[PDB]
Each structure stands twice: as C-alpha cells, then as structure tokens.
Ligand binder design. Structure first.
Ligand SMILES: *S(=O)(=O)Oc1ccccc1-c1cccc2c(=O)c(C(=O)O)c[nH]c12
Length: 441
C-alpha cells in the first residue's frame, strides 16, 4: 500500500469491509497528528456536525471553511459558524455563471508537519454514513528547517501544483496556507494533482486545468502500448451535466480524446459510464433518499437519451459496497480484460462540462465554470508500467506496491432493458425501498 487510497466507513457492512476504511473522526484523530489549524475546502457544510468530528482537545483550534456560497446561502453558512469564534470563512469567487465550489480537501497543520487530504465527501453526516466515498491521504510532510533552502518538491510537481491551485482563489486566507505549504517538504508525494478552477484558459494556461490537464499528464508521463485502442475508458460519477444533443458535441469529441491520451505520439475505444440505476438506489442501504445526492434532473436527461446507452450499473462486491450508493467519482484506463489499469483518478469532478472544461473560441480556449480537485495515480510514478487490479479491495495482495485497489467491480455491467438512470426529480411509486417508502419529490 503505497497508494494511500481509502474508502469512507459504511454503517451496516460487516467489519471485514470497514477494516482499512476511514471515518472523518479517524482522519482528524490525534494519531494522525497534533492539530494546530486546518482548512476545510468543500461544497456543503453542517458546522455543528463538523466541529464534533474533531477530537475534543482540538475543537477550538482555528478552522477555515472554503466555500462557494453567495447571497442567502452565504448568510446561512455564516450563521452556522457564528457560535464558533475559531472558525473563519473564505468565499471562493465564482465569476462564471452556473459554477460551483465542489473541491473537497483538508489542509491539516500539525506540530509535527502538514497533511493534505483530497476526498469526495461533503461535511455532512449523510455523506459519511452509508455512501461509497474516496479519500487520498498524503504522507506526513515534515517542515523544512529554518535557514535551509530546498524545493521540497516531488517528482510529480505536486507542491508547486497545489500552490498554483490555491493561488487561483486570489484569497488572503489561502495565501497564508500557501506560505505554510512553502515551509514543508512535499517531496515524497507520488500522485499528480488535477484541478479545475473557473476561467477561460488560452495558450500555455490551457494545459493547467480540467481535461486538458489530464491530457497533458497522460501525454507526458504515460506510455502508449500496442492494442491501446482496445483499452477501455471508465468514468464513474454521481451526477451528469447537459452534454449536448449527441456524443460528438463534447463527450466523445474533446472529453474522450483527453481520456484516451497515452504518450507523445498520435475511435474504437470502448467507453463505460457507471451511474446508479433506479433499482440500485431503491435497494440501497439508504433507499430512495440516496437519490437526494444523485442530482440528475429530468430536464437534463430528456435532452440526451443517447447518453444512457453508455450507462452501467453500480456494483461493488469487491468492497462490500454494492448497496452503498456512490458519491465518489473515479476515472481509469483498464486493459481489455480489466486485469490491469494504465492510470486511476479519484476526484470531485462529475461528468459535466462545468467540472471538466469545454473548448471555446475555435478550440483555442478551455472554459471551466467550477472548482474541482482530484489526484492521478500513474504507474510511472511508482516505477511501474501498469497497475494490477486488486481482486478484493480489502484483501492482502501478493505485491501491494503493484496492485491498485479499484473500489467497484470489473467488468462494469450494462443496464438491463428495464433499468433507468436514477433521475432525482420524478416520482418512483411502483416498488418501495429498503425502508418501506416511495419517492415523491
Ligand atoms: S447545492 O446548492 O447544495 O446543491 C446542488 C445545486 C445544484 C445542482 C446540484 C446540487 C446538488 C444536489 C445534491 C447533492 C450535491 C452534491 O453532493 C454536490 C457535491 O459536489 O458533492 C454538489 N451538488 C449537489
């Protein structure tokens, strides 16, 4: 286990399937470090709940909440935090319409060093209760000695890249965290940062964010193999944006083209999209309320029925999580027999142009609406040509440094003819869920 990729704990599965999963209380535990201060980047917050997840002895250490809320939503979040004098707030600018601050990250400053946590869960009870969520834990980064001049940089450029991500906010509270990061040694980091920030990127900046950032990393740090056209692409997400009237508008033109990049040189490639069916949701641990966090609207869906022929059911027997609906998002490049993968990405980014970017101005400008963040696992960053897929997520492989814990089942299973994608704002009243209820929005 050099990967430090974890799932959140799920209430209701056997201990087997929570051994080696992490609750937020585990992440914040004193065993991970003696907390001095922390920043919580997220979308949705329950501040009363969040403070209770810190150890009692750490609950009055400074906390910065980085959010995107405006107007009345912003006022609600300030009211939530008002009782806690140690909580500050940073409103991330969202200067492009319909953008959101979706990045989920913890910056944890300790007496002993610094830790970075990039994950997929909102800071609310339900996101850590019975959902499948993903976590990347950085190593404990030591502080660089005062007077020592060294970069603290990793072979993946993670330190400069994380600072660049923070600089995009142009925010005084985050300049303080940038200076903290400058003072620490991040050289052990073996993942690449893939962020989105709002803007319109041309020229050099084109490769900094979103799907062009992914394409650049795959061009530069992966190698193309023979029969690469046979290696599928897998995207796994919990919501879908408006992608256009057919697959040529965005999904299999620019988005798939970035995903299928390997190496420097120059489509038959199968595209598998994993998104919960109605039946997945109905029979889940949560029942239909799980669909409250799968926000695919009928208005969007009915304009792109072509897309649903790509959809595969959620299935996660390998991690005992078939009934724990996904709020994790992942993208990866498996071999034709799904025994190996060329790379793996865990991210906040759903399958949307807002999250990944859409080309504008005759292909010269990448427009991104939202903040997103993920980390990319490349075999080259581990001295490998590919990763073997771990057969059981929580089991003991024969070579863990070469065996990546994919958290759901392969090959993905196509929707049946009676299945439908979960669409959250129409009623389901033909069969009740695991709690005995229908869904009437
Ligand atoms: S937000 O304003 O709280 O909610 C919105 C707003 C517009 C579209 C979708 C959503 C939404 C609904 C349910 C769950 C969501 C979620 O889990 C995220 C996330 O980034 O984690 C984002 N939006 C969600």
């Amino acid at each position: 286990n050099p990967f430090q990729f974890y799932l959140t704990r799920v209430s209701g599965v056997k201990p087997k399937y929570n051994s080696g999963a992490l609750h937020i209380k585990d992440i914040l535990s004193p065993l991970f470090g003696t907390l001095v201060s922390s920043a919580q980047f997220n979308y949705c917050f329950d501040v009363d709940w969040l403070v209770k997840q810190y150890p009692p002895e750490f609950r009055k250490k400074p906390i910065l909440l980085v959010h995107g809320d405006k107007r009345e939503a912003k006022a609600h979040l300030h009211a939530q935090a008002k009782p806690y004098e140690n909580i500050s707030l940073c409103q991330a600018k969202l200067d492009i319409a319909f953008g959101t601050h979706h990045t989920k990250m913890m910056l944890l400053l300790y007496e002993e060093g610094l830790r970075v946590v990039i994950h997929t869960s909102n800071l609310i009870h339900a996101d850590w209760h019975q959902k499948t969520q993903g976590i990347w834990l950085s190593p404990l980064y030591p502080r660089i000695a005062d007077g020592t001049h060294k970069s603290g940089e990793s072979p993946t450029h993670f330190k400069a890249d994380l600072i660049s991500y923070l600089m995009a906010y142009n925010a005084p509270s985050l300049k303080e965290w940038i200076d903290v990061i400058h003072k620490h040694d991040l050289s052990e980091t073996n993942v690449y940062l893939i962020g989105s920030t709002p803007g319109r990127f041309q020229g050099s900046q084109k490769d900094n964010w979103g799907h062009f950032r992914l394409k650049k990393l795959l061009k530069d740090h992966a190698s193309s193999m023979p029969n690469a056209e046979s290696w599928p692409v897998v995207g796994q997400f919990s919501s879908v944006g408006s992608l256009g009237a057919d697959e040529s508008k965005w999904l299999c033109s620019e988005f798939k083209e970035s995903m299928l990049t390997l190496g420097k040189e120059s489509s038959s490639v199968p595209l598998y999209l994993i998104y919960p069916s109605v039946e997945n949701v109905r029979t889940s641990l949560e029942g239909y309320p799980a669909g409250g966090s799968l926000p695919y609207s009928i208005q969007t869906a009915e304009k792109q029925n072509w897309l649903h022929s790509y959809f595969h059911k959620w299935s996660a027997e390998t991690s005992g999580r078939s009934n724990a609906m996904p709020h994790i998002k992942t993208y990866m490049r498996p071999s034709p027999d799904f025994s190996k993968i060329a790379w793996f990405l865990v991210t906040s980014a759903n399958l949307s142009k807002a999250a990944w970017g859409a080309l504008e101005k005759n292909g010269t400008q990448l427009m991104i609406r939202s903040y997103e963040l993920g980390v990319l696992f490349l075999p080259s960053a581990f001295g490998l040509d590919s990763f073997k897929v771990k057969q059981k997520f929580f089991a003991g492989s024969q070579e863990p440094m070469a065996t990546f814990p994919v958290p759901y089942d392969l090959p993905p299973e196509l929707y049946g003819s009676k299945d439908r994608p979960w669409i959250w704002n129409i009623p389901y009243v033909k069969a009740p869920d695991t709690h005995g209820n229908m869904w009437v929005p």
